Design a protein around this ligand. Structure first.
Ligand SMILES: [Zn+2]
Ligand SMILES: [Zn+2]
Lengths: 91, 97, 201, 97, 127, 25, 214
RNA sequence: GGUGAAAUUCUUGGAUUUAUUGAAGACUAACUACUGCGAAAGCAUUUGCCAAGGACGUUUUCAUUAAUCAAGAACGAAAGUUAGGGGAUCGAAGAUGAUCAGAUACCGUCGUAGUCUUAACCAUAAACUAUGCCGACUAGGGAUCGGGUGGUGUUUUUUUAAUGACCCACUCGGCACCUUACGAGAAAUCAAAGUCUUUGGGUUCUGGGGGGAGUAUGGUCGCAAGGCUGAAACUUAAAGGAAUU
């Protein structure tokens, strides 16, 4: 059954630290502890260690990433921007 | 036993059109309403043209014109513009003059 | 003591048969088994080490040399980058925006690795407890916990003393003050809540 | 288009899925076409291409990963390479070569 | 063929400007305003003020040596009126009558492509 | 009075009353 | 009590060879002393002058041209092309209600390293037996026409240099070319190049400059 | 400068004005219309990518799958809230100059939040064609948007071909409009507000004199602001709608 109505993972902190702080932490800690899809093997086995490091269980590939998610919006913009610049030079 | 009060009638609106600003008061008015005119005027008044043609090189010279579209709100148009006020019947008319 | 991850990159020595290993700061997106190209004639891809003259304008780089040979000074912490915002090909200079907002002018021969440094989003999370701040700083240095001058005695701090906890004098203190007298907001050109557009130019 | 083609081959013709069975059929010469996902490792891709240039066999590079190729050939699992060894009612060999 | 300048009239409401330049613009000659002549603080936009100003400007132009002048007439433009004020006609008549020759005339009021919210608010300038 | 401003009046009154009741509760 | 017209030095401006006539104008700069010699004060100047004035034909009563000063030969400097623009009066006369307006832009490089944005405009017209007022285009014709104009401007640049380009812009050959290419899409009156503006210059090429003399 | 006129303000340390450049962010003028798309809110620079949708056409297929719908869901202007970024302009608050009997208002100069964006909340509006959706019938007229048909039709071509754009006739589907009342209506007005005491095509929602009161209370949603739901006591003979002089 569903055990908490809204706190979720941040029920480990109980009554402490304040609701807004626990909410911010919740939002980030979900991403933190999630499983993501490998760009290389196509499987959903990417977990983090050691903020910024995302390992695939299978395939053993390790990607540099964000601290609580694999890809940040900034780096997405960067790879698209750099692609556009490279193509502006050679295409 | 709920009880309420007045309530009111209606004009064919659109949807949404973006607003413009009145050229005198700066009031935001939607373009559909927005009384609109086109000021096309010679740069020079009708009398200075003789003096300026006498004083100008380049015969026929050009006499260009300055053009600008004026948007008036209703209040400012009624205070100035030729919009003035009409009877029930004449205010169905829609022709310019 | 570093939120940004590192990349152990292995290169070959041109002059002796061996492998020379180098420690880069990982740009976001780089991965194990990836080839890293370093030099003047390297392609514009994430993780590559190019000169900031060779890159075009709008390019996003990191670990970028102040002057050629220092091996990386700027845009090195988590999530940070500099933007290139113009070249001056005469006198081989290049104007760039740093993460503070400052514009700087660097040599075009100064290298920079393409992309943003990983570990971003780190300071979004509430650290949320003193123990986590403790474990943060016991791997950096003894800068934590911090007691207030107002909370200590006058021998121990300028703000110390009083029958109430107060400073008594303007906490804004000159750049020409000397050691022992510099314990507030040093050379503060303004103070207070920041309102409106800063970075005025 | 290629998806509908493959969907016809998968019900009418003779196919095998997976790297080992492709390589086996390709050593045997039974294979006509191989479709290769995009996210497959480049070494595996190269080995397949080389086996194919030895067997004189055609190669299509699927613009899609192994999950997408699984869905395209009608399977709830992911597949990185497909071998078409007898096309049935389809047209896929001549549609592209 | 004669020697030319450009008059660059700015007939806002609330004041007028007549200041002649070289063909390039960097070289400025004989700047005067309607508020330099009259001392009323509200007749600065009057045609009389503009006429007196243009008379002075044409005198200075003749002293320096300037025979003809192109005209670039202007209003405030931008988000403001973009309709020329009263002093423009007056100044034109003035420095046409006052010996100078008039080349080509142009209206150079800065017009936007609907930029930068106007002043007055949403309900406008009231009274 | 204008109904807009009567509504605003009752709203300010309503939140004053919420606060005054929280004092006890 | 100085009267700087004691010192301000009367000076000439001569246009390049490729319009019709070169004697454009006279400026005043200053007296070229040490501490701000005049040849560094007057080398960035631009001069907006009518193509009617520097071509003799009043048909170019519009089409102002900006010439940018580049060199000096003894009170007799030769200048070069910096831009072309229409006049506000002509734009606002063109722009009439009850028709569709078409604008096109393209950034293009010449056969030399000049880069420039060139801005064309066109207006629908009413086809000579037409009863309805308004003469609007679909909004697919419009993008067809924009594509055509862009192609034409790109292929009419990176032909020859600014010299031949100005030689093309003056007698308005591109306009007739657009008309011919858009016969089969939509009628299209008042075809023009509203602007041509420079945004990047080559490295000063004094041979190509000084090959514009008498 | 700014104004009705002023002052506040800036200014020979050289303002305003001119020219040449640059940066920043916002906005898409004129064209722009009784024109278009969209469930509405709403949507106007170019180009490309992504997927969607209507109408038309169709001697294509399915075959009654449909209409409206408590509950229950998605979207939902502006303001507002949270956090980052951005922060030019305008500008709740505030400060100031003036006007004024007063003027902590209108006018003027500054200007914080906001105005922009990203990720989330809120969920209201004269959110208005205060006209619910579906379906059928009933009067004339012309014009317009989109699609289609036909015409020895005009023009551009290559005199003369196709197309493209126009013209004529017709047609389906839309935004609407002009005229009239066979009708309807309290009238204002209405081609729907008609086909209703000659009262019944199908279906959902809401109202029962005015105030109190959309208040109190209780629940529920919400970070909050608040939203949804929602009385009673008590009071009162009028309140109100269209038109008339
Ligand atoms: Zn993997
Ligand atoms: Zn107004």
């Amino acid at each position: 059954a569903k055990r908490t109505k809204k706190v979720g993972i941040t029920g480990k902190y109980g009554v402490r630290y304040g609701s807004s702080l626990r909410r911010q932490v919740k939002k980030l800690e979900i991403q933190q502890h999630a499983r993501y899809d490998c760009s290389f093997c196509g499987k959903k086995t990417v977990k983090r260690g050691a903020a910024g490091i995302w390992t695939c269980s299978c395939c053993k590939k390790t990607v540099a990433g964000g601290a609580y998610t694999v890809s940040t919006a900034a780096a997405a913009t960067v790879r698209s921007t750099i692609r556009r610049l490279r193509e502006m030079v050679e295409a | 036993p709920k009880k309420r009060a007045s309530n009111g009638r209606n004009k064919k609106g659109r949807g949404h059109v973006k607003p413009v600003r009145c050229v005198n008061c700066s009031k935001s008015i939607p373009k559909d309403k927005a009384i609109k005119r086109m000021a096309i005027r010679n740069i020079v008044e009708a009398a200075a043209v003789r003096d300026l043609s006498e004083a100008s090189v380049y015969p026929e010279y050009a006499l260009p014109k300055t053009y600008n579209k004026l948007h008036y709100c209703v209040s400012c148009a009624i205070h100035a513009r030729i919009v003035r006020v009409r009877s029930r019947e004449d205010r169905k008319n829609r022709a310019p003059p | 003591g570093r939120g940004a991850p590192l990349a152990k990159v292995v290169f070959r020595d041109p002059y002796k048969y061996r492998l020379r290993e180098e420690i880069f700061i990982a740009n976001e997106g780089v991965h194990t088994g990836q080839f890293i190209y370093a030099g003047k004639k390297a392609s514009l891809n994430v993780g590559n080490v190019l000169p900031l003259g060779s890159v075009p304008e709008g390019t996003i780089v990191s670990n970028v040399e102040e002057k050629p040979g220092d091996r990386g000074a700027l845009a090195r912490a988590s999530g940070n980058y500099v933007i290139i915002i113009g070249h001056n090909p005469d006198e081989n200079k290049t104007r760039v925006r740093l993460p503070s907002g400052a514009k700087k002018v660097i040599s075009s021969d100064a290298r920079g690795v393409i992309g943003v440094i990983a570990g971003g989003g780190r300071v979004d999370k509430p650290l949320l407890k003193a123990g986590r701040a403790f474990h943060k700083y016991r791997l950096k240095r003894n800068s934590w916990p911090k007691t207030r001058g107002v909370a200590m005695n006058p021998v121990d701090h300028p703000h110390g003393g009083g029958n109430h906890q107060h400073i008594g004098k303007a906490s804004t203190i000159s750049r020409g003050a000397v050691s022992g007298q510099k314990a507030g907001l040093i050379a503060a050109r303004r103070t207070g809540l920041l309102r409106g557009s800063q970075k005025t130019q | 288009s290629i998806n509908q083609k493959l969907a016809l081959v998968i019900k009418s013709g003779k196919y095998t899925l997976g790297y080992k069975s492709t390589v086996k059929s390709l050593r045997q010469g039974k294979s006509k076409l191989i479709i290769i996902a995009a996210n497959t490792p480049v070494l595996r891709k190269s080995e397949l291409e080389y086996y194919a240039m030895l067997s004189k066999t055609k190669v299509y590079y699927f613009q899609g990963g192994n999950n997408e190729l699984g869905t395209a050939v009608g399977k709830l699992f992911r597949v990185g390479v497909v071998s078409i060894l007898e096309a049935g009612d389809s047209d896929i060999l001549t549609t592209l070569a | 063929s004669q020697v030319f300048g450009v008059a660059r009239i700015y007939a806002s409401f609330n004041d007028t400007f007549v200041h002649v330049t070289d063909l390039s613009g960097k070289e400025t000659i004989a700047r005067v305003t309607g508020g330099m002549k009259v001392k009323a603080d509200r007749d600065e936009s009057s045609p009389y003020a503009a006429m007196l100003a243009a008379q002075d400007v044409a005198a200075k132009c003749k002293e320096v040596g300037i025979t003809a002048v192109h005209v670039k007439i202007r209003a405030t433009g931008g988000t403001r009126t973009k309709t020329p004020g009263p002093g423009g006609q007056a100044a034109l008549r003035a420095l046409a009558r006052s010996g100078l020759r008039i080349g080509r005339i142009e209206d150079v009021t800065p017009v936007p492509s609907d930029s930068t919210r106007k002043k007055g608010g949403r309900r406008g300038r009231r009274l | 009075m204008r109904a807009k401003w009567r509504k605003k009046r009752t709203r300010r009154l309503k939140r004053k009353r919420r606060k005054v009741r929280a004092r006890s509760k | 009590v100085v009267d700087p017209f004691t010192r301000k030095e009367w000076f000439d401006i001569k246009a390049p060879s490729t319009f019709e006539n070169r004697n454009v104008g006279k400026t005043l700069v200053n007296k070229s002393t040490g501490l701000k010699s005049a040849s560094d004060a007057l080398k960035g100047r631009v001069v907006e002058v009518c193509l009617a004035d520097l071509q003799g034909s009043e048909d170019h009563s519009f089409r102002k041209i900006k010439l940018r000063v580049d060199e000096v030969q003894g009170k007799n400097l030769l200048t070069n092309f910096h831009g072309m623009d229409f006049t506000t009066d002509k734009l606002r006369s063109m722009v009439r209600k009850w028709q569709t307006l078409i604008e096109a832009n393209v950034t293009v490089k010449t056969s030399d390293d000049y880069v420039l944005r060139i801005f064309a405009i066109a207006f629908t017209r009413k086809q000579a037996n037409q009863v309805k007022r308004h003469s609007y285009a679909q909004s697919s014709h419009i993008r067809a026409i924009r594509k055509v104009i862009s192609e034409i401007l790109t292929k009419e640049v990176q032909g020859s240099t600014l010299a031949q380009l100005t030689s093309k812009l003056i007698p308005e050959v591109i306009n007739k070319e657009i008309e011919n290419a858009t016969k089969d899409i939509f009628p299209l009156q008042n075809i023009h190049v509203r602007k041509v503006k420079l945004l990047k210059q080559p490295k000063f090429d004094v041979g190509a400059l000084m090959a514009l003399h008498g």
